[model samples]
Target chain A: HMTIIESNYISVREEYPDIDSEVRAILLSHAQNGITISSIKSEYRKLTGNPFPLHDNVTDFLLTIPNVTAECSESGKRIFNLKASLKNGHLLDMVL
Target chain B: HMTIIESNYISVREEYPDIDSEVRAILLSHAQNGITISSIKSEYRKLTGNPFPLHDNVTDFLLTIPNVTAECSESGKRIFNLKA
Candidate 1:
């Protein structure tokens, strides 16, 4: 279930090794449902095989992606918008 | 907004003229919730700017986009599966 983005994350991970790059790849792939820091940590762990908790290391990684926007909700969760402008931008433009 | 897929459908229409190509472009863009024949007709009309009665003309266009699967509902409307 966690591997829903079987599209190209591993290849993306291989292509770009940094946490911010990998996280941006994941966020770009997930435009419809957007994503959360927890899911990002989970998937990043799954991709990198780092069982070590990413609670702190992966939390603020999105700040580097610049184009992304996270809005605070009633759940106190940051809802990131992975919409078209960013999604259909460089990822789709350069990759495929 | 219906134009949520406004990312590339118009360009896709320009790149590919046939309705089948345009429809497939739209379907590929909409993998999250899929789309209905009505919405397809609506957007196709929105793109091509022709309301020439797609009730019969626009339905069954998916027959050309072979990767798509449409399940008929009890409402008698065909529900096209756009799941990734």
Candidate 2:
């Protein structure tokens, strides 16, 4: 099983509001598993539950993100992680 | 496992040999085991006596042919030798 996250790793809560808000407005989107919030905006699968969408488009989308990197294990079978810098705002890690 | 075959292995019978003919036009298409003449055109599954054909294109029209090499002693799961 492979996993892919989104590119826009951060946004100001009050500024972006509904745009990058967590599942509920009061919560902060931290350590959430699955694709970033942006992918859900593009009709991609939501990252919190079952029925995980196929990683076809999301795989391609992650590659385009500035700092995002895609990592695969088991010879590219399982994607274990997606990492990036949300605070610094410039460097992108896209770690696995 | 992975297997691939064809860039035209080899064939020579009569003058032009009906473009690689065998099996009743039949005689030495080799054993009649499965898949010799053509890629079964289009479909899946065909092993001598079975009516199924799903190796996805006669193993790639001979793309990857998994040689029956070994079988798991407990699980019966076979580990085929798929070689090009």
Candidate 3:
């Protein structure tokens, strides 16, 4: 049996097959402290060499997920804020 | 004297000082067709060498504006889908 997190991750990937599974994982990993779009781009560049140009699309996708929001900074930076306490099952509830 | 679009652009720049005004202009210029993040990056690179690096932030900022959105593609690519 798949764990709830795994199941939710799968569902997310299935719902938005265009989004990379790794991107979702990275966003989830930073559920607590939150992560910046620049940081995510840097990490993506470090791993993939090419630019993760869909930063906006990824933000939109994550926002669709339950309890996930993009916090805006006065400097126009946005950090992905995920409510870690809300488990994948909760997300499943939103999706279903 | 400023036109409505210019006024709106100025307000946006003032609200988000950290965001480059040029970036906002580029986005606005492409309001009709809606450019891609990669394209925006490319334009940024052409004008300024350093990477834009804040594609997500810019997207979020634009979304807060009237009618802007980012559309996803099947190939894992995303295009800025502004309501022209």
Candidate 4:
């Protein structure tokens, strides 16, 4: 899927549970800034001519992070914020 | 309809009641210079869609001037300025 991982938060906290509320507040503010995820997805769908892939999995990734939200469309378009977790020296991980 | 017209007038007057109200005071500041109109519609709409059709009576046409304010948007998605 065409994904844009946006954030208002500049840094990820080492302690997730403790900073959960603060992080969620930051994410919601970003969502309200301008343009909706569905709108961006619709535009992308029009431009790409393909529904974005891995919609639910991306949403689930956001769900695990306390302050993040996966605002996704049924056609597989989503907007979210997820801390890029490092695993065994790998730079990224596919939540799915 | 998609019609791009022109301007803030260098001169289109032989004489029409000595000009009308400073031409509507920037004509709503060129319809609020940000973006809004028929055929020349919204932001991304101007970039992408093609809903512009020869809509109506054409305001009967008139003396041409040069303000350059036609913008568009629908589904095809345009941002601003008729250059798109």
Candidate 5:
């Protein structure tokens, strides 16, 4: 190890470059809900010829993004969508 | 005699129209989390002459929405947020 910063910082995307960019694009692209981990994993394999490269479900990353919302559908599947507005409506907005 | 359409098919907002619209508007407006029922109640009073018109908390309406999410905060205040 060096005295200052370490080698390359070992970026989170170093091994997951494809999933990193693709996941965000998918979330933003889906104006409506229904984006699921199965879909993401499926699409990733088709594009990169490999699975998501991890065992964790999609929400592991989905929930990490800002404005990305999720809920349980009637069928029990987790639905995902983007938040409608920038602020928390008037309720929480007033506090800020 | 009675009729099928005799009543106006009472709307959910018939009594609390302001809260109905404002609640969804609030949910949509908050892209980030931290949206709470207390805040919504406070704002409702400021806009209208009366309270939210019901005893139920904001999530009573917020949860009814499509994408709204709720969770407990560190203080255990049921910290309601816009999920995501």
Candidate 6:
């Protein structure tokens, strides 16, 4: 069964029409692995030769999804992390 | 291994020293099952016989913790729902 946290991410993915499934998949994967917005932008630029258009929306949506939290660095860069709250009362960390 | 999400919650939990472990457990439990702020307040009142003192802070902290989103009702009441 898809956990509540997974479901929440899917819902947020659906809400943003501009974000295609491929991009969503990459974003979610990066999020679960703990990535910074700046790095994501750089990766996107490297891949497409253009900046990630929905930077702000992606950050906002990620913040809204349950079990996802962010921490700011000393230089003020925010790094997103994912932790799945399992039904068995265990918390699973998705970041390496 | 504690997932990043769990770790995030624990970090926030540590930041707010005022919120005891018991209360934090209750809140996280409710959040996973999906709950509203008003309902949480009611439940808190029922359990403690007093209003939840850290209402604003709790909400703010919850917002910062990923995967939590809020939807506003037609009546203009903000219903904080936890999908996780």
Q: DockQ (Cα-based) per candidate?
A: 0.01, 0.02, 0.06, 0.01, 0.06, 0.06
lDDT of 6 at A72: 40
Better of 1 and 5 by lDDT: 5
Candidate with best lDDT: 3
What does the lDDT come to for candidate 5? 0.54
lDDT of 3 by residue, B1-84 (tens): 322221254664566564555565667778776677778888777766666645334555555544344544334444554334
Give the distance in Å from residue A75's predicted Cα in candidate 1 to where it truly belongs: 2.9
Error of 3 at A13 (Å): 7.5
| DockQ, candidate 6, vs. native dimer | 0.06
Off by over 4 Å in 6: A1-17, A20-23, A28-34, A53-59, A63-96, B1-17, B20-23, B31-42, B45-60, B63-84
Q: What is the C-alpha lDDT profile of model 6 across A1-96, one tens digit per residue?
A: 322332344554566444443344445687545677677677767766766655334555444544554554334445655544453566688976
Residue-level lDDT tens digits of model 2 in B8-61 = 433322332332232122222322333332434221123234332233332222
Q: Which has the higher TM-score value, candidate number 1 or candidate number 5?
A: 5
True contacts kept of 6: 0.00
Candidate 1 C-alpha lDDT tens digits along A1-96: 122222243453455557555666778878776677777767878887774233332323343244554434444455554433422434344654
- Residue B66, candidate 4: how far off, in angstroms? 1.4
Q: With candidate 6 superimposed using the best TM-score fit, by how many Å does residue B64's alpha carbon deviate from the native?
A: 5.6
Instruction: Give the range of the ten consecutive residues with the poorest summed lDDT in model 2 chain B.
Output: B64-73
Best by TM-score: 5
Error of 6 at B27 (Å): 3.4
- Regarding DockQ, does 3 or 4 come out ahead? 3
Worst window of 10 by summed lDDT in candidate 5 chain A: A1-10
* lDDT of model 6 at position B63: 51
| Candidate 3 residue lDDT tens string, A1-96 | 322221244665676564554565667788776687778778767766667645335676555454444544445455664444332353344553
Clashing pairs in 1: none
Weakest 10 consecutive residues of candidate 1 chain B by summed lDDT: B1-10
Could you give the interface RMSD of each candidate, to one decimal? 20.7, 17.8, 7.3, 20.9, 7.5, 8.8
> Could you give the CAPRI-style class of model 6?
incorrect
lDDT of 4 at B59: 19
